[PDB]
């Protein structure tokens, strides 16, 4: 008995290979700008641009041609549209709802996953509506999140992804989608979303997010979201939490998603550009997700990877 | 879970092609396919097999030609099965270790021409015996376990000498994986893999194979599942690098228990009769061709790492669309 | 230690045999024609005939004499009786309800399992009522399925078997059976029914059926149907899904059924007729089910097998 | 599950005979039955056993006659228990390996006459010792473990020489399964099975057996269950092909743990006193005869593969209706 | 390594002994006759007598002195008091209710466990009220069982033990006990009660009882009764079902009881009287229960065993 | 379960003494008690131990007198701990195997007088070394593993020669259980049990023991639990018949994991400091005496089969009421 034997030759290695990454596993997050004919580079994320809707529709031709199953939209809210009440979240003319209708019309088979969250619409930037002590009120925030989820479903979104970490929001959003007849709008719960330093570059583009030290607690997060009606559950961030992906997949045997966040992408790309890491690291970082038990991966590398995989 | 309707509606992920693709748990690729091939003596020879429509016995020169195609489609390996001329079949099965045997020649030829292509030889003696039973017989007409194994060792080494990267003892004698592993090791063939036919049942699904090659006390009872786990545990302990379940689809439960219990490289053979019944149904217009991919997907879903299948070329063609 | 020892002799083999198939495991599916004195051979399924009720009652004498515990009825709906609303599903004079009353009268101990499904009664052939996009509406279809299940129970059926793959239908049907006093009508849920090519010959005789790639998902299907009140759960198709039978039996320890579908039967019979497989394959294919954990098997071979087992 | 009344009503499957049959989890067949038989010296001899009503000690000629019936009913095997003439009982138990001993003769006779019928011999020395204890005694009056085993090996080989397909060391010495396995192997008896009496308790349920054959520091404490799993694990490691729990019904929990833990061929002995108490109750009219099948079903339900039972013939008769 | 070592000497055997039977494990079932100064021997159960209440109170002095924790009462209903409606079940002057009040008064620390069942009060002997087909109606029987359970609690019984095998009866009885303020009356559910031949002698003294072949099904029985509020769960019969005791204890880790039924006692006693088994078999049969995972044992041997254990 | 208030009220079983008794999961008996005893040289000698109030060092004659009482109360065994005169303490610890050592004499004396009473000797060398460390020291002042074991083997045999039914290697060297088992076996002492001190921690709870007998690189880190399972697995593999956790109450979790993982005879030592802190609190009137039974119940509840406890006599007295 010697484990080096199946490694000796590529064919044996290929036969015993436990996981394979394909384009079916890739979800491309995209930053969406208001206006027309807008493209902006993000210095903290090389190779990634914020795009106005007209320019998103053009780039999406190639994403659809590459086989990318879905996009996750993250609108870039004009400063003037942020408020205490986060009303723009549910504006039928907000960027996300306009972008959803445009993409659903132009590319009917492309999955659109919208972001249900109040932080892009509050002046203070927090994931909810504040009480008089500056604490994010859970239930009152959920009422706004519910209206937002409904406006996404009305715009045609096949998937709504509540990223807010309010307790009970998955059931509250499900109940509203069910009462309104949006029977088939999927809910992708950000179940175990951690208070992480890896988010730094997304912001350029503790009382509610999880403590990085906690593993068991993630299981209780996901059990609640499945009970409350999530069709998919997600871990965020990604690589730094692969152990959490593995336990969530092993324990619940449900569709499990993972977000390779902006910071993870920045780190990898910076190292690649400096010549410190070979470009093959991209596919390796993506394989790690599959190996850990992810069914799908939100990654800003989705285009580059779909290109390498198509060849 | 406490997943309850209508909060939970399992049809939502199924509503669109994109979400189905995102949640799809298993996918078959060409890296999962092994093509078994019947190899003739001689030159410019092909023969059709009546009970295996579309499958041909091939002389080595013809095998080299088809293999060109198989390599381009990305098939990682072949399992070679010689078709022994009746003259060379003896009482003591010496043609097995003959280094000018079909297997050994076919192996040298493919190893020279396609270096990256895996070759899996058959370590057995039923194809080299007049009597046609799996090993040397005693006077009662019953397979001797250990006498059978002195021959098997010799055949195994002859294959490694030919360049075979994998030998596959299909005989179902006890303790043979260790005996061959020991012989390969001390002879210095430390990188030759052993793919044990661990859970091999006494099945009616083998009918057409006997027609392909010209030919219960050792093979497993179809009723038994736990027994299969004891068989596989002994072969891993004896040094098997990979273990196999045979037949295939009729034993998908075994594949799944064997994978769950050992988390070892696990292989399954879609045998001749499985191929014949699918193909016949496809030819009568009773089933659609997409049944081929479905059958193979089932193996992946059950936990198989690789699949020995006569559909390997068609499946590889279909996967490339 | 040598595992060949208990195989050496038939008596030891018999002692250590882990599973045995008996007639108690066999359910015969039967195709039922309208009219009188009708018998039709099915070319895609040799040895199987569609039968009018009068002829079904005659053949059932031998099925009862052989010990076959139950029949599963599949009516062959006249073209003219198919409609958009699938109303014939719940017709007290439909074939299935007439056939049930006739069999319950003539053979009171023989189990009758009816098929709760809309596909034999829709002009478009889909398992439900369509919305204006051509998608099978879940809840509206369940209302029709409920009326059908009630009409089967009124006809005397001891078991109703919802084959439709609508979410929630098992609980909706249970609730209606319980409210109407049909306290003991069993519900045999088709829990994990896959979108399969093996069904081709039944049709001669994706958004709701399961993807063949998915295993874990089958567990969630069956957990819901048990919670919703199924007395038995079923996997369909059969042989190609024995791994699913095994996991369902191991995980839930509930009465587990499997359908050896028309395609599986065709494949086996064709091969037998061509001389490619020995006839002993029939009992081997049936044993595989038992070994995998099935308690019962719907098989078109039920008659042939009960004959081989009686000897 | 979240199975809740009234959505879930467990009586629905029980409402009709047909649904009960469909969901029935276990079924007893004749393939599960082993008939233990007390074998006399001599010719045209039968003796009734007072504490085992309906069971007869049988000379070999009589055993051959009854076995005709047992074979026709499909009983797969007998467990032979010789009734040693008091003359042949010695200090060093040499009658054990005597090839004209009852067991060895009875075995040759059944193996010649009914070739397909399994014979399971008893490897022990309590029946061949003046003292009546299970093995050679030292001067303190206590069973020597390893000295006992030098005799057992010899008896075991004498049975295999007679044609016994299974030997069953019932002694409860440690390390004896390996010692016998080693001796059978090197003597070339590679297909003789060893059915280890693995979990054998110090039970009051054995009373009548001592009456049948004329006759705590080794047998297990009735209070212990985990201990049984350690006993069985050692016997499998030592080469046992099958393991047994004895007594039976009073230890159904052990049968179930032993099956769940090892997934190995597991046997259980419904001992003399179990038979006597059921039969006596049946004769007094206190229990119905259907108790026989119920008792046997319980073993199957618990996980037993085979059952050593004095009811084997009656049960086989009842199963055929 | 040799397992015979700890067996060599009694002290080691005693140290490693995994289970011990004590009097705390014993519940004595008792047959109660109407009238005064009545004692009747039971030929099918030697050493056991039916007793009128006055004579039960006398014998109970010795049962209490021996440490027997509880009695299970089984009234011997006068023929004239049996009816179609089973009304005597809930009669405040029925034998069981009179016997309960008398024992609760005289021996306040002795546990009384009453039998909630309709079979001793129906003219036909079945465990419920029949419909017009001769089938035991489940829900209607539960209404009578509920009134009976209430009459036991009013008489002072600390434990009511529903032996009837009606689905849902444990929750229905719990709900009624809770609504009436009988907050602490324990419910000992006969969860897995099998249709058994071992009951023959009790009768002297299939559509609702379990099939002896079924194991898994017992787990579903007990899961329902725990969910519905049972404080204790029981397997009946005993020895023939020790595998069921073991799995119930392992799976649920709840207070588990077992009934060594009349037939088991008869068999053992007959054999002892004929000299076929030593008297030590009694303690061995009782130890088997403890070893299998029973917390308590209903046994007619409770007196004899408490005597052997006291010495 | 889906057990929910108010359908489920866990106080109902607690409402009366009878139901509490019926559901009581564990019960302590005298069969669970082992009395450790400090044994003096000489005659008519008793000494009080300041840090162990109520416990006396006893010359063998006095030990024989008290043991009368211990045997009548049903205590199954004693664990002997000699108190070595400072003269007999050497560099190479030879007093260990001296057959006129306290242990060996005390053992012969109890084995003759109370044949049924179990004696568990201490196989160690810290009590026989001038330096006071557990084994022969090298020049760095660190315990040599294997040199220590050559002495231990010799002490072990000397105890078996004295009649000790159990030896208990308390040293915490690796591989010592196998070395002693091997030596006992080949010397013919096949029934001497080995009770391995498997999970023995580097604890502050041992303070008073050192006072009782006059006296981190080997003992386990208190922070570690998984490590304990690896220790116990090696000792079972090496032939231990019983394994022990020490200290006790501060390690009840270890007792529970060790029992759950191996289902082997598992013992726990309520060490000197556990005894001292309870007893002191009882003497100050801070805790009631019933704490003794509570502490012992906890061991049973945790899964201990037997408990080495200085409270053994008081507990046995209390259990008899
Ligand atoms: K995927
Ligand atoms: K693979
Ligand atoms: K069945
Ligand atoms: K069997
Ligand atoms: K108890
Ligand atoms: K103990
Ligand atoms: Mg949450
Ligand atoms: Mg093998
Ligand atoms: Mg469903
Ligand atoms: Mg043993
Ligand atoms: Mg119930
Ligand atoms: Mg150690
Ligand atoms: Zn947010
Ligand atoms: Zn072969
Ligand atoms: Zn349908
Ligand atoms: Zn014996
Ligand atoms: Zn009743
Ligand atoms: Zn020490």
Swiss-Prot record, chains B, D, F:
Quick one: which pathway? Porphyrin-containing compound metabolism; protoporphyrin-IX biosynthesis; coproporphyrinogen-III from 5-aminolevulinate: step 1/4
Gene Ontology process terms (BP): heme biosynthetic process; porphyrin-containing compound biosynthetic process; protoporphyrinogen IX biosynthetic process
Q: Which InterPro entries match?
A: ALAD (IPR001731), ALAD_AS (IPR030656), Aldolase_TIM (IPR013785)
Which molecular-function annotations from GO does this UniProt entry contain? Answer: porphobilinogen synthase activity; zinc ion binding
Catalysed reaction(s) here are:
2 5-aminolevulinate = porphobilinogen + 2 H2O + H(+)
- Which cofactors does it use? Mg(2+)
Recorded hits in CDD domains, A to Z, give: ALAD_PBGS_aspartate_rich
- What does the record give as EC number? 4.2.1.24
On assembly, the entry states:
Homooctamer; formed by oligomerization of dimers.
Q: Which family does it belong to?
A: Belongs to the ALAD family.
Quote the protein name from its UniProt record.
Delta-aminolevulinic acid dehydratase
Native species: Pseudomonas aeruginosa (strain ATCC 15692 / DSM 22644 / CIP 104116 / JCM 14847 / LMG 12228 / 1C / PRS 101 / PAO1)
């Amino acid at each position: 008995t010697r484990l080096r034997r199946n490694r000796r030759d590529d064919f044996s290695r290929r036969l015993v290979r436990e996981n394979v990454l394909t384009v079916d596993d890739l979800i491309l997050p995209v930053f969406v700008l208001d206006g027309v004919n807008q493209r902006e580079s993000i210095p903290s994320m090389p190779g990634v641009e914020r795009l106005s809707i007209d320019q998103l529709l053009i780039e999406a031709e190639e994403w659809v041609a590459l086989g990318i199953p879905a996009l996750a939209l993250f609108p870039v809210t004009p400063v003037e549209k942020k408020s205490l009440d986060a009303a723009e979240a549910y504006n039928p003319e907000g960027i996300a709802q306009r972008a959803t209708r445009a993409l659903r019309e132009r590319f009917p088979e492309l999955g659109i996953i919208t972001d249900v969250a109040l932080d892009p619409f509050t002046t203070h930037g927090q994931c909810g509506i504040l009480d008089d002590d500056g604490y994010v009120l859970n239930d009152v925030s959920i009422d706004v999140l519910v209206r937002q989820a409904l406006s996404h479903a009305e715009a045609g979104a096949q998937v709504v992804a509540p990223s807010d970490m309010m307790d009970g929001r998955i059931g509250a959003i499900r109940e509203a989608l069910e009462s309104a007849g949006h029977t088939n709008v999927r809910v992708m719960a950000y179940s175990a979303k951690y208070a992480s330093a890896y988010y730094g570059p997304f912001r350029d583009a503790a009382t509610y997010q999880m403590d990085p030290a906690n593993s068991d607690e993630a299981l209780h997060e996901v059990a609640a979201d499945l009970a409350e009606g999530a069709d998919m559950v997600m871990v965020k961030p990604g690589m730094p939490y692969l152990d959490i992906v593995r336990r969530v997949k092993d324990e619940f045997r449900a569709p499990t998603f993972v977000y390779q966040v902006s910071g993870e992408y920045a780190m990898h790309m910076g190292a690649i550009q400096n010549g410190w890491l070979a470009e093959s690291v991209i596919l390796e970082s993506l394989t790690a997700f599959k190996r850990a038990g992810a069914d799908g991966i939100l990654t800003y590398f989705a285009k580059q990877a779909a290109e390498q995989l198509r060849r």
